[PDB]
């Protein structure tokens, strides 16, 4: 099972996202079901070395936020135009 550790976005916006991307991180959103959407921060290298597997977009993901387990699945992703990097990932709670 692909396990990831995440943070919580205290500040949003273009500036916050660019700071996260320059600090070897990137924002992501988790939504679905009936609960409130959650804005998380993820490490860049630890997810770039994981998404290269085809199982990453088919299997389940176990995300750890505030010391609890959340079962999500990859739903959408935005990639850098001309670089092998990531900018945002949308997960569905499932």
């Amino acid at each position: 099972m692909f396990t990831i550790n995440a943070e919580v976005r205290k500040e949003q916006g273009k500036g916050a996202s660019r700071r996260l991307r320059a600090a070897n991180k990137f924002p992501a959103i988790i939504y679905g079901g009936k609960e409130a959407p959650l804005a998380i921060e993820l490490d860049h290298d630890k997810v770039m070395n994981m998404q290269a597997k085809a199982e990453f977009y088919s299997e389940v993901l176990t995300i750890v936020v505030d010391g609890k387990e959340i079962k999500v699945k990859a739903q959408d992703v935005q990639r850098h135009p001309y670089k092998p990097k990531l900018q945002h990932i949308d997960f569905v709670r499932a």
Partner: protein, 136 residues
């Protein structure tokens, strides 16, 4: 030499080349060549690159050209003054922005596709890179 068969108007303005691209991900074949720089591609550079990659792969497999020259670049004659109207259309140019994929290829080994696209990059003016298709 790619060229539209008809157009509403013969001469267009210059405009700009600001912003990123839309066709970033490979959607037709398996491997692709993606621009990193920003410039212009004529109807001759693309033809030369296509011929080079065709010779590299020995006409095997299938290739796709996702760009097309639709901007009628014009040039005035030599030794003429300024004004007196607009020049005559000479060649066609496709605007290229970073992230745009120029060529795609399928049914070819990756180790041969890399050199087939390197040959095309060596003739194209802008800098490019080799990419592969990915699952969403």
């Amino acid at each position: 030499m790619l060229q539209p068969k008809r157009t509403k108007f013969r001469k267009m303005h210059k405009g700009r080349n600001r912003g990123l691209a839309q066709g970033t991900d490979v959607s037709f074949g398996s491997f692709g060549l993606k621009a990193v720089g920003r410039g212009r591609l004529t109807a001759r550079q693309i033809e030369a690159a296509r011929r080079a990659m065709t010779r590299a792969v020995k006409r095997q497999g299938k290739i796709w050209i996702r760009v097309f020259p639709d901007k009628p670049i014009t040039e005035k004659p030599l030794a003429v003054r300024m004004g007196k109207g607009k020049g005559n259309v000479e060649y066609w140019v496709a605007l290229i922005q970073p992230g745009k994929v120029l060529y795609e290829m399928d049914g070819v080994p990756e180790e041969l596709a890399r050199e087939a696209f390197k040959l095309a990059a060596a003739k194209l003016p802008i800098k490019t890179t080799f990419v592969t298709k990915t699952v969403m």
